[PDB]
Amino acid sequence: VASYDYLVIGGGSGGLESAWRAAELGARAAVVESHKLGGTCVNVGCVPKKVMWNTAVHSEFMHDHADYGFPSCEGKFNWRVIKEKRDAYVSRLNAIYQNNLTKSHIEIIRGHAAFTSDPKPTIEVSGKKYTAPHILIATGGMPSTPHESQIPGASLGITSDGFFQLEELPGRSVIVGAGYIAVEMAGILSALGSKTSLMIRHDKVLRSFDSMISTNCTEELENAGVEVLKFSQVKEVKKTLSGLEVSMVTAVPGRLPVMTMIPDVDCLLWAIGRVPNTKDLSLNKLGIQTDDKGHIIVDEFQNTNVKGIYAVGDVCGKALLTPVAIAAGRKLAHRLFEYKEDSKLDYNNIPTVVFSHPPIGTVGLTEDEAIHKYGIENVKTYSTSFTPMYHAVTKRKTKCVMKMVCANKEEKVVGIHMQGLGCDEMLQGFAVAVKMGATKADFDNTVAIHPTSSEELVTLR
Amino acid sequence: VASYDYLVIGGGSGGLESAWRAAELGARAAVVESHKLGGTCVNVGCVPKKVMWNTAVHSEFMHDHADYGFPSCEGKFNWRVIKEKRDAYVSRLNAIYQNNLTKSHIEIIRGHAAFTSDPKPTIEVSGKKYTAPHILIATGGMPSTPHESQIPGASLGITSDGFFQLEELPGRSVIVGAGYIAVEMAGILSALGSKTSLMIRHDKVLRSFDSMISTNCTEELENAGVEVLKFSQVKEVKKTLSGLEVSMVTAVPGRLPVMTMIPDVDCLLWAIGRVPNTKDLSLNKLGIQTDDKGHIIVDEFQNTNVKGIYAVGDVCGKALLTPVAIAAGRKLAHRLFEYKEDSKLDYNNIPTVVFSHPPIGTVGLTEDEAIHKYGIENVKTYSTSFTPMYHAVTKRKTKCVMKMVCANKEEKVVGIHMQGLGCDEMLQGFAVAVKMGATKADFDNTVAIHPTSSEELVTLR
Ligand SMILES: Cc1cc2nc3c(=O)[nH]c(=O)nc-3n(C[C@H](O)[C@H](O)[C@H](O)COP(=O)(O)OP(=O)(O)OC[C@H]3O[C@@H](n4cnc5c(N)ncnc54)[C@H](O)[C@@H]3O)c2cc1C
Numbered sequence: 001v002a003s004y005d006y007l008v009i010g011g012g013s014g015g016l017e018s019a020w021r022a023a024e025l026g027a028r029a030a031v032v033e034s035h036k037l038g039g040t041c042v043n044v045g046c047v048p049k050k051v052m053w054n055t056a057v058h059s060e061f062m063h064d065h066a067d068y069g070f071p072s073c074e075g076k077f078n079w080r081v082i083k084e085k086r087d088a089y090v091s092r093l094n095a096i097y098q099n100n101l102t103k104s105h106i107e108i109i110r111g112h113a114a115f116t117s118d119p120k121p122t123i124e125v126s127g128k129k130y131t132a133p134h135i136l137i138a139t140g141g142m143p144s145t146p147h148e149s150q151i152p153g154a155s156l157g158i159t160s161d162g163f164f165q166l167e168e169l170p171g172r173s174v175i176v177g178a179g180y181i182a183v184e185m186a187g188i189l190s191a192l193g194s195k196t197s198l199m200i201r202h203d204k205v206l207r208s209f210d211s212m213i214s215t216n217c218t219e220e221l222e223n224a225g226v227e228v229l230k231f232s233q234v235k236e237v238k239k240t241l242s243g244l245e246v247s248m249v250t251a252v253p254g255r256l257p258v259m260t261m262i263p264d265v266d267c268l269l270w271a272i273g274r275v276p277n278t279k280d281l282s283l284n285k286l287g288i289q290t291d292d293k294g295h296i297i298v299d300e301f302q303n304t305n306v307k308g309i310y311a312v313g314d315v316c317g318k319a320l321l322t323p324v325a326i327a328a329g330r331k332l333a334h335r336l337f338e339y340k341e342d343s344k345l346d347y348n349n350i351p352t353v354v355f356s357h358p359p360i361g362t363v364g365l366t367e368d369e370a371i372h373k374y375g376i377e378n379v380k381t382y383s384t385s386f387t388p389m390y391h392a393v394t395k396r397k398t399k400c401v402m403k404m405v406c407a408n409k410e411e412k413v414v415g416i417h418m419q420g421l422g423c424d425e426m427l428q429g430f431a432v433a434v435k436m437g438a439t440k441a442d443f444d445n446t447v448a449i450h451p452t453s454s455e456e457l458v459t460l461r
Numbered sequence: 462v463a464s465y466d467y468l469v470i471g472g473g474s475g476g477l478e479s480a481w482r483a484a485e486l487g488a489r490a491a492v493v494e495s496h497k498l499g500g501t502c503v504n505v506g507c508v509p510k511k512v513m514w515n516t517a518v519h520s521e522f523m524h525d526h527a528d529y530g531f532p533s534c535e536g537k538f539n540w541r542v543i544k545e546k547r548d549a550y551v552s553r554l555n556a557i558y559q560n561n562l563t564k565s566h567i568e569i570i571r572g573h574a575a576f577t578s579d580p581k582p583t584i585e586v587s588g589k590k591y592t593a594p595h596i597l598i599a600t601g602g603m604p605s606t607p608h609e610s611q612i613p614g615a616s617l618g619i620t621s622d623g624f625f626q627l628e629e630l631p632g633r634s635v636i637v638g639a640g641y642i643a644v645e646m647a648g649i650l651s652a653l654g655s656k657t658s659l660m661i662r663h664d665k666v667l668r669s670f671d672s673m674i675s676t677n678c679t680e681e682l683e684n685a686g687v688e689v690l691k692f693s694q695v696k697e698v699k700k701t702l703s704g705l706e707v708s709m710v711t712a713v714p715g716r717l718p719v720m721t722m723i724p725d726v727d728c729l730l731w732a733i734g735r736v737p738n739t740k741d742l743s744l745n746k747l748g749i750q751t752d753d754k755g756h757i758i759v760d761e762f763q764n765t766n767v768k769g770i771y772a773v774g775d776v777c778g779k780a781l782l783t784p785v786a787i788a789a790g791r792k793l794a795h796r797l798f799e800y801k802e803d804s805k806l807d808y809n810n811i812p813t814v815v816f817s818h819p820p821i822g823t824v825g826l827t828e829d830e831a832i833h834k835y836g837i838e839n840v841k842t843y844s845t846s847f848t849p850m851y852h853a854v855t856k857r858k859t860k861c862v863m864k865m866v867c868a869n870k871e872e873k874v875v876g877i878h879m880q881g882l883g884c885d886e887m888l889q890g891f892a893v894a895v896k897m898g899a900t901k902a903d904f905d906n907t908v909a910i911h912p913t914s915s916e917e918l919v920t921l922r
């Protein structure tokens with residue numbers, strides 16, 4: 001049994017970041033990775049995604065090339081190519097990580113970890129036992145795909161992972177999901193050719209965001225050429241000689257249900273879930289407490305119910321983004337190794353950007369969460385709806401919607417929601433501001449940048 | 462003599478904005494405009510500019526279309542077209558302004574104003590006299606072009622105005638200036654075809670910005686294909702049968718001066734100055750005090766040395782941007798009409814974005830202004846130099862440089878400087894933060910957006 005000071009299971013974002021801060025404060029640390037380091041962020045998430053998004057933003061422009069006074073192209077985008085190059089980047093990234101870890105002097109034990117009986121907190125890896133007072137579990141989370149029980153033909157669908165394995169742009173895409181990975185997937189395929197359809201249980205996507213966002217984004221997906229199939233779900237999937245035949249039910253409120261066939265489908269995407277990676281961790285042997293869905297349960301300091309065992313990132317099932325993994329992983333290293341009793345991540349005002357077309361940007365709480373936490377009389381909302389100056393000379397148009405949720409007398413900006421061009425790099429500055437309890441005044445006292453979209457967020461009337 | 466409560470001379474940004482706030486607080490106001498309302502911002506500045514910049518950003522992409530997996534185009538951009546459309550937009554904008562003013566019920570007296578003898582503050586317009594206790598002078602500023610005395614062939618050069626009148630992209634461009642309108646002009650023409658050259662007195666442009674910016678921007682102009690001609694100035698210009706022949710002197714420090722001919726020049730741009738519009742205002746009749754360069758002199762409340770006479774915008778010669786015109790014009794309306802003794806514009810931390818390729822973004826003071834106001838021991842600078850993920854798959858590359866100037870113990874962020882993709886909509890959030898005395902910690906406590914460039918500004922180490 002090799003004893004350490006820190007043992008971090010999983011080598012993805014949350015975790016790499018912790019072990020790293022731990023080595024920094026002086027600590028005998030190891031990270032147990034089952035396969036590719038960099039986790040999801042590098043391999044099949046953030047990075048591969050943004051590359052494709054970036055590729056998509058190029059079709060949107062190729063469509064406006066004529067309006068801006070240049071001739072045009074024709075079409076035929078070769079997916080094969082961009083695919084290859086995106087992979088060589090993931091490779092470069094992995095090698096950087098390989099080197100970075102080995103240089104910061106961290107024992108990268110490689111293999112599959114699990115908990116044993118061993119009285120005090122101890123893990124095995126490929127028949128070897130390692131232990132250390134503090135073991136952090138950062139085992140991530142995987143894509144949820146339906147069971148053949150419920151949906152016969154379930155296994156025929158592909159997920160984000162498989163999406164990042166596509167060697168050719170699928171001429172006909174079908175996406176099931178109304179969240180962000182769904183919205184994101186639907187947009188890339190549509191922009192890049194595939195006649196796509198987004199099948200959602202209700203009438204709008206991103207039902208978890210502000211009304212304006214969930215609304216404006218369903219609409220934009222529509223004008224973009226996506227096909228929102230509302231109050232629908234796949235009954236069964238059947239591999240024809242053509243491709244796939246999706247039988248889905250459209251049960252619109254107030255109407256009579258109708259069962260439909262969706263033929264010659266190239267790709268059927270399960271963009272419905274991220275189940276935690278907890279099963280074969282064999283937590284059971286320590287009584288490590290969990291969710292009724294496998295997620296590990298921790299307190300406001302990332303402590304499991306067991307002493308010396310913690311959790312961070314996707315696995316815990318809260319704020320499923322890379323930076324929350326990092327911010328939670330590194331903050332821990334300081335509580336422990338710097339002996340800082342106040343280091344914990346404040347899960348409020350966490351900013352999230354969704355890369356649809358156009359980009360969704362948002363931080364803080366929504367009108368409703370607000371109205372509830374304050375009072376219908378206490379919540380004031382300012383908003384704007386304009387057209388980016390980018391479409392003063394284009395036929396192809398998209399909007400930009402900005403909303404500000406203020407609280408109480410002083411008009412404390414407690415929620416900023418927006419969709420529009422540049423909304424990806426637009427948010428962050430305001431996140432810092434918002435994080436530092438900015439009032440509508442501070443916003444209003446800031447001199448504008450003209451001409452910009454951002455200027456609109458500070459001139460709200 | 463028609464008496465009012467407010468009389469605003471000039472109908473541009475500063476001014477329209479004031480008169481407007483004045484009408485809002487209940488006031489008999491008028492605005493005396495000599496020609497096109499909207500001033501410079503609409504007609505020959507901000508707006509016409511951003512349209513062209515936007516057009517330029519399209520060539521930069523057309524050059525990367527192949528890398529992103531699509532075929533290509535060929536070249537031949539028709540300037541004629543984009544030109545036309547940009548004008549119809551200025552027209553739409555003017556009409557909006559025409560209507561807006563007439564609806565907010567403001568007497569738009571049209572013609573050329575001037576001050577008379579008349580004991581108490583009084584102006585004439587086309588042989589008509591108007592007066593009112595408060596008269597604001599927002600007469601703007603014009604482009605400075607050399608005198609035939611100094612430079613024989615001076616009048617042969619065109620300025621920003623004329624640039625916005627070009628009906629065809631000039632195959633050979635020559636630009637004299639090392640400031641932002643110069644840098645901006647040089648970039649658009651180069652991206653859009655014209656074999657351009659930027660003749661500057663020294664070795665770098667934007668000598669007024671942070672070292673990093675002034676440096677990185679000279680370099681980027683170079684890799685972009687511009688031609689920085691250092692320690693050079695035009696001796697004389699001569700209209701040949703071909704086009705123009707620029708004779709310029711290259712007096713590099715440590716070398717021997719050399720006089721050179723620059724043949725077949727299509728366009729020679731005077732991007733050197735903005736002299737105030739004060740001459741025929743006939744201030745003289747009131748003793749309205751000024752600069753040794755015509756600029757009006759005011760105090761920290763926009764008061765001239767005469768009671769009941771104020772000044773705002775370009776004319777005053779400070780912070781020559783649209784928003785400073787607005788922020789100064791509207792703040793005045795409240796001091797006066799709302800009777801607010803504290804309404805004045807804090808000219809510190811004013812944010813400015815320069816639209817070069819890539820975009821320059823910056824707010825607060827530089828390392829040097831800082832080091833001086835604090836102490837070489839008291840100023841700490843954090844910085845990053847990375848490549849936007851946009852060029853993970855491109856051959857064509859550009860960087861991104863971010864610098865943070867902190868002050869004292871608490872590491873107060875007192876200056877943010879950057880150049881890079883999306884740096885146009887990136888700045889503003891931080892401007893609010895910076896405006897509210899943000900410390901490096903607040904920056905550091907903000908959860909990141911991944912993947913973004915903005916995330917880099919909050920993870921500075
Ligand atoms: C498409 C797509 C787009 C996304 N886009 C974004 C985005 O734009 N922005 C964003 O901020 N987030 C995004 N995410 C989510 C985000 O990347 C996750 O929150 C983030 O990956 C951090 O995860 P984590 O640290 O919990 O570890 P994970 O990334 O899940 O990685 C854990 C690592 O642990 C290893 N492992 C598992 N169990 C064990 C065990 N028994 N022992 C040893 N090794 C084991 C795994 O092999 C893996 O490499 C996206 C996800 C997908 C899929």
Ligand SMILES: Cc1cc2nc3c(=O)[nH]c(=O)nc-3n(C[C@H](O)[C@H](O)[C@H](O)COP(=O)(O)OP(=O)(O)OC[C@H]3O[C@@H](n4cnc5c(N)ncnc54)[C@H](O)[C@@H]3O)c2cc1C
Nearest residue numbers: 471473474475495500501506574601602774775782783786
């Ligand atoms: C290229 C170019 C790009 C620019 N880009 C930007 C930018 O991106 N961002 C930015 O924020 N700023 C920019 N500016 C500068 C900015 O637009 C000025 O600060 C801004 O125009 C505000 O000016 P002002 O309010 O003092 O009035 P001005 O815009 O100069 O307008 C004054 C109006 O007054 C009228 N007038 C003059 N004298 C009299 C008198 N005797 N009586 C009656 N009428 C009279 C004029 O006809 C004019 O229409 C740019 C300028 C140029 C040229």
Ligand SMILES: *SC[C@H](NC(=O)CC[C@H](N)C(=O)O)C(=O)NCC(=O)NCCCNCCCCNC(=O)CNC(=O)[C@H](CS)NC(=O)CC[C@H](N)C(=O)O
Nearest residue numbers: 013016017020041042047093096849850911912913914920
């Ligand atoms: S996808 C892995 C992810 N990376 C980030 O979040 C980058 C942000 C920040 N620079 C950071 O903290 O790394 C992540 O989960 N990283 C966490 C981790 O545990 N970090 C350990 C310490 C690593 N710090 C070393 C800094 C330089 C290392 N660089 C690389 O590993 C290569 N690139 C990156 O990791 C990221 C994503 S691949 N780089 C970029 O995104 C490019 C720059 C910019 N943010 C952009 O989006 O263009």
Ligand SMILES: *SC[C@H](NC(=O)CC[C@H](N)C(=O)O)C(=O)NCC(=O)NCCCNCCCCNC(=O)CNC(=O)[C@H](CS)NC(=O)CC[C@H](N)C(=O)O
Nearest residue numbers: 388389450451452453459474477478481502503508554557
């Ligand atoms: S170029 C004139 C300039 N306009 C602005 O600075 C716009 C910012 C802000 N919305 C504003 O205060 O107008 C300016 O000098 N304006 C000052 C003026 O004196 N204002 C009087 C009151 C006008 N407020 C009415 C709001 C709606 C009016 N809209 C128009 O006049 C048309 N468009 C605009 O004025 C601007 C520039 S043409 N619109 C945009 O830039 C588009 C939106 C976004 N900012 C973008 O850049 O895409």
